[PDB]
Amino acid sequence: QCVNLTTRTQLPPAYTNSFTRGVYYPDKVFRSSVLHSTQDLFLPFFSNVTWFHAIKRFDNPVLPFNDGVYFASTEKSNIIRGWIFGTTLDSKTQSLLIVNNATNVVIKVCEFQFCNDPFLGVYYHKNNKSWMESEFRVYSSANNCTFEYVSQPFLMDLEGKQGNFKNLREFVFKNIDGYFKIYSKHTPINLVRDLPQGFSALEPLVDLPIGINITRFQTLLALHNSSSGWTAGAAAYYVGYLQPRTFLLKYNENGTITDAVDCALDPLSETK
Amino acid sequence: CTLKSFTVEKGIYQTSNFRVQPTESIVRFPNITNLCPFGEVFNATRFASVYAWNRKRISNCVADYSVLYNSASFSTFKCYGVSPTKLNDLCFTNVYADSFVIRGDEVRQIAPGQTGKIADYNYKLPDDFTGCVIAWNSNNLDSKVGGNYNYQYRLFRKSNLKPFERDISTEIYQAGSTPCNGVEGFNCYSPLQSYGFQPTNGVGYQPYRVVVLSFELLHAPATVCGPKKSTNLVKNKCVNFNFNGLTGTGVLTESNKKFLPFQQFGRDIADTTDAVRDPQTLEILDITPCSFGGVSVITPGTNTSNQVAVLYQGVNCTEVPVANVFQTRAGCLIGAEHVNNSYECDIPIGAGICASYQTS
Amino acid sequence: GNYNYQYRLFRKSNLKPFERDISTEIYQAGSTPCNGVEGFNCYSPLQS
């Protein structure tokens, strides 16, 4: 079966700016109390990140993919579950599935068929607040496929509406010469939901050696049956695109990145 | 020899740069891991024939070969790409495994570019074939006392098929151009014929269990290749090491620095490798180059005498035999006796130390 | 079939420049030694 939703709202692409974000470890090397300069794919500073509201209210079209992407979201009760990756995503080309369960997350690389509104909705049960998922309607079975993997999940707290959103998930996805590299960080905030100031470094997580051409992708989020049929809580996320640039990075004494500067922003930056 | 002359005058000279010689070499790499479960295929209940031989995809694991290879449990063996002895050193993106049981009397037709009943209709290989073919004598179990006719093989085929293009449909083969009517008729043949394997069979008639291991190259990153070994680490010696594919020579010492659990390599401002994490056990080691420095010869003019002295620069001369003594800040000088007396300089060495010729 | 020409398909390893081999003793593909002239991995070092 292929169930589709009727109660959702469409909003224009909201524009925001990060002011400091998009810095990750470029490789696996230890450097201490030094200044390094490197050229690689980074999110440009002060860019126009696109903001999508998912609050009942869904906003998840298919977005273009090129030279990886930066995806950042804050949300409690874990309504987001994963993504898909491919070029046509219709039962005829190699496809990739990422889906984060409360159990071990699973990674799949197979042919797949998809519904118009595929998702992993959890039916709300009065017996248990963290009730088991009910309608995970994305595919039944396409055919023989290529790659399967299982790993530990990334976060927790299936339920909760605490005042301070301790869930800030930042991810960067790249695909280079047959390797799919994921950089991830999970940091808490106790302030307004907008993009924070400051600085943080995204430690590397994993690289998957498959080798495919990826040009489009789409996010996957669950949905509750709490009221009025299909109604969810509040969630949102931000999408940004990478570009090739040269950065200057400052490795501290302990070996951890503490500051960075973009050498294509303004004359003071490049003379630095 | 260096000065290209048969006379030498008073004064120090420099020549014959010195460097310590290493002893041995070592390799250190992660533990064995997800080895491929091909044994259960080899130790399965039902094995395949040549019409529908088991074709399987193998990836994302290490395939142990040497233990199975050098084990006497095989009969014949033929790698078409390279020497099997180093099979573990070639890594494959994906492995096509073709396992089957046939009659050995046609095994010569297994090889590419061969003609025969099994090499023309069902089982084919390209001229540029690479994979290794392994066969084992298996008359003990495959053979049936009453005749194992469950096995079948493509006796006939109208037109030869491309390699690895198995056909499992068993449409009634038309030997002649006359139309075939009914399930069986004139010039109508069953393409599949039943094998006969019995203990009373002789050489060649005994069933052979054969695996052909082809693989794909470089379209995706290589994943499947044999396990690799390692040797116990040693310290305080100028040795050769291959750590995570980085080959170097130096002396390994413990370190007080602490890496992040994700970085492996330590570098300096000069951008050279000096700290490495061991792959087996989680620890951090510093690398120090073993000593090196040019040699100096101190001598009066050859007109006067022939005695000389040798100065090793920047070397603690407790390390001279591995190539009267006296150490100064510039290195260690041998061949000369130092005195408590003081004079004016005649031949300078450095750090205030000068040498000369004097009485005996 | 002019199978009169052979070629050394089996050898321990590669060789130096400008040397030739005449010995045709039984090959040792496996680490287990091959006593006699027949058994497992007891191949002739030539092919036709």
Ligand SMILES: *[C@@H]1O[C@H](CO)[C@@H](O[C@@H]2O[C@H](CO)[C@@H](O)[C@H](O)[C@H]2NC(C)=O)[C@H](O)[C@H]1NC(C)=O
């Ligand atoms: C799953 O198996 C099918 C059947 O073998 C594969 O489809 C065949 O692929 C070969 C190789 O290109 C073609 O020659 C055949 O024409 C295909 N069959 C059909 C009916 O189209 C398929 O490729 C396999 N899937 C994967 C992911 O390997």
Ligand SMILES: *[C@@H]1O[C@H](CO)[C@@H](O[C@@H]2O[C@H](CO)[C@@H](O)[C@H](O)[C@H]2NC(C)=O)[C@H](O)[C@H]1NC(C)=O
């Ligand atoms: C960087 O490492 C140093 C030590 O290598 C850390 O210094 C220690 O910090 C703890 C807690 O602040 C103290 O209890 C120790 O006495 C300190 N030891 C030394 C030798 O300084 C330092 O904290 C690390 N950096 C950060 C940000 O934690």
Ligand SMILES: *[C@@H]1O[C@H](CO)[C@@H](O[C@@H]2O[C@H](CO)[C@@H](O)[C@H](O)[C@H]2NC(C)=O)[C@H](O)[C@H]1NC(C)=O
């Ligand atoms: C398939 O089964 C055979 C029968 O047991 C295995 O042969 C034994 O393997 C174990 C493994 O260490 C050895 O200790 C025994 O000595 C082997 N038997 C004999 C008679 O030597 C064989 O190993 C199995 N296949 C695989 C891939 O493990």
Ligand SMILES: *[C@@H]1O[C@H](CO)[C@@H](O)[C@H](O)[C@H]1NC(C)=O
């Ligand atoms: C970025 O967004 C701001 C605010 O909407 C807009 O004024 C500016 O023109 C945008 N810059 C682009 C799209 O390059």
Ligand SMILES: *[C@@H]1O[C@H](CO)[C@@H](O)[C@H](O)[C@H]1NC(C)=O
């Ligand atoms: C992969 O996708 C690209 C982008 O559309 C296209 O050239 C083709 O479908 C594939 N190319 C290669 C080299 O695999």
Ligand SMILES: *[C@@H]1O[C@H](CO)[C@@H](O)[C@H](O)[C@H]1NC(C)=O
């Ligand atoms: C040694 O020196 C003396 C005077 O300086 C000179 O007369 C003599 O020829 C020299 N001998 C040689 C072998 O150079």
Ligand SMILES: *[C@@H]1O[C@H](CO)[C@@H](O)[C@H](O)[C@H]1NC(C)=O
């Ligand atoms: C030489 O080594 C010895 C022992 O290792 C040490 O006592 C001495 O100070 C060293 N001298 C120099 C110049 O390094």
Ligand SMILES: *[C@@H]1O[C@H](CO)[C@@H](O)[C@H](O)[C@H]1NC(C)=O
């Ligand atoms: C130099 O004098 C000191 C102090 O009198 C003495 O200990 C040392 O042995 C003397 N060395 C020589 C070479 O005479």
